[PDB]
């Protein structure tokens, strides 16, 4: 359980969607961050793979503002502290959102993975996972925006898998965060996106998993990896 509460764009602090506290105010700012109903602090599971709550989130809406991003920069998502327990994948992706990101119709969205990270060490079962090198980097996760890509405007949304109740199904506790990017750059690639509600499959194998012994593999959850 945590959400992201601070960006940091090639430097510059941008206040997440404080779902902890703008649910019960009358006027919250206005964020580059998603605002969501996710106000247990809570996750999306498998139930909701296929329904646009998995998308960024449950209830989620576009955040009111856009951050510019230099090229190849890099967006540094600050979490609240992140449970141990809560062993798993980070996962990023972009979605073009081919005008205001505000705006946008979220079920429309077609991401492409970015960025993915699964199972770093298993010597000691549950082992040594992304989410464990998250917390270990002062609760935070850092992506580098590709090169490659035609600029304009994108959500990001970032990813945490938590796997520590995988073992039955719709177990899997997916805490996706998105924002909204201003992508520069020399880039002209549109990568082959996917909709939010076909990223996962409450079967795959890297969802419907058993972390409690030794895993010689793991594959990360969602479509092919962009380069
Ligand atoms: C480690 O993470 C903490 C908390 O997530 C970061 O704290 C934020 O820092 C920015 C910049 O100073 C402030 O504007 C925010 O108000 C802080 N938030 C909280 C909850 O304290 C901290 O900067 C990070 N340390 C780094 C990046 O070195
Ligand atoms: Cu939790
Ligand atoms: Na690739």
Same mark, same amino acid.
């Given at each position: 359980?945590?959400?992201?509460?601070?960006?940091?764009?090639?430097?510059?602090?941008?206040?997440?969607?404080?779902?902890?506290?703008?649910?019960?105010?009358?006027?919250?700012?206005?964020?580059?961050?998603?605002?969501?109903?996710?106000?247990?602090?809570?996750?999306?599971?498998?139930?909701?793979?296929?329904?646009?709550?998995?998308?960024?989130?449950?209830?989620?809406?576009?955040?009111?503002?856009?951050?510019?991003?230099?090229?190849?920069?890099?967006? $540094?998502?600050?979490?609240?502290?992140?449970?141990?327990?809560?062993?798993?994948?980070?996962?990023?992706?972009?979605?073009?959102?081919?005008?205001?990101?505000?705006?946008?119709?979220?079920?429309?969205?077609?991401?492409?993975?970015?960025? $993915?990270?699964?199972?770093?060490?298993?010597?000691?079962?549950?082992?040594?996972?992304?989410?464990?090198?998250?917390?270990?980097?002062?609760?935070?996760?850092?992506?580098?925006?590709?090169?490659?890509?035609?600029?304009?405007?994108?959500?990001?949304?970032? $990813?945490?898998?938590?796997?520590?109740?995988?073992?039955?199904?719709?177990?899997?506790?997916?805490?996706?965060?998105?924002?909204?990017?201003?992508?520069?750059?020399?880039?002209?690639?549109?990568?082959?996106?996917?909709?939010?509600?076909?990223?996962?499959?409450?079967?795959?194998?890297?969802?419907?998993?058993?972390?409690?012994?030794?895993?010689?593999?793991?594959?990360?959850?969602?479509?092919?990896?962009?380069?």
């Amino acid at each position: 359980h945590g959400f992201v509460q601070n960006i940091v764009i090639d430097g510059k602090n941008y206040g997440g969607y404080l779902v902890n506290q703008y649910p019960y105010m009358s006027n919250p700012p206005e964020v580059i961050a998603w605002s969501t109903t996710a106000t247990d602090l809570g996750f999306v599971d498998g139930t909701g793979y296929q329904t646009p709550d998995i998308i960024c989130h449950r209830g989620a809406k576009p955040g009111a503002l856009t951050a510019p991003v230099s090229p190849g920069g890099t967006v $540094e998502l600050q979490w609240t502290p992140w449970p141990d327990s809560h062993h798993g994948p980070v996962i990023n992706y972009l979605a073009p959102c081919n005008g205001d990101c505000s705006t946008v119709d979220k079920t429309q969205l077609e991401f492409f993975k970015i960025a $993915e990270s699964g199972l770093i060490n298993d010597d000691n079962p549950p082992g040594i996972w992304a989410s464990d090198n998250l917390i270990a980097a002062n609760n935070s996760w850092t992506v580098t925006i590709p090169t490659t890509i035609a600029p304009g405007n994108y959500v990001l949304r970032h $990813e945490i898998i938590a796997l520590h109740s995988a073992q039955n199904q719709d177990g899997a506790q997916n805490y996706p965060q998105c924002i909204n990017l201003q992508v520069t750059g020399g880039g002209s690639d549109n990568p082959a996106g996917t909709l939010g509600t076909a990223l996962y499959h409450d079967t795959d194998p890297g969802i419907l998993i058993n972390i409690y012994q030794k895993l010689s593999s793991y594959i990360i959850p969602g479509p092919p990896l962009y380069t």
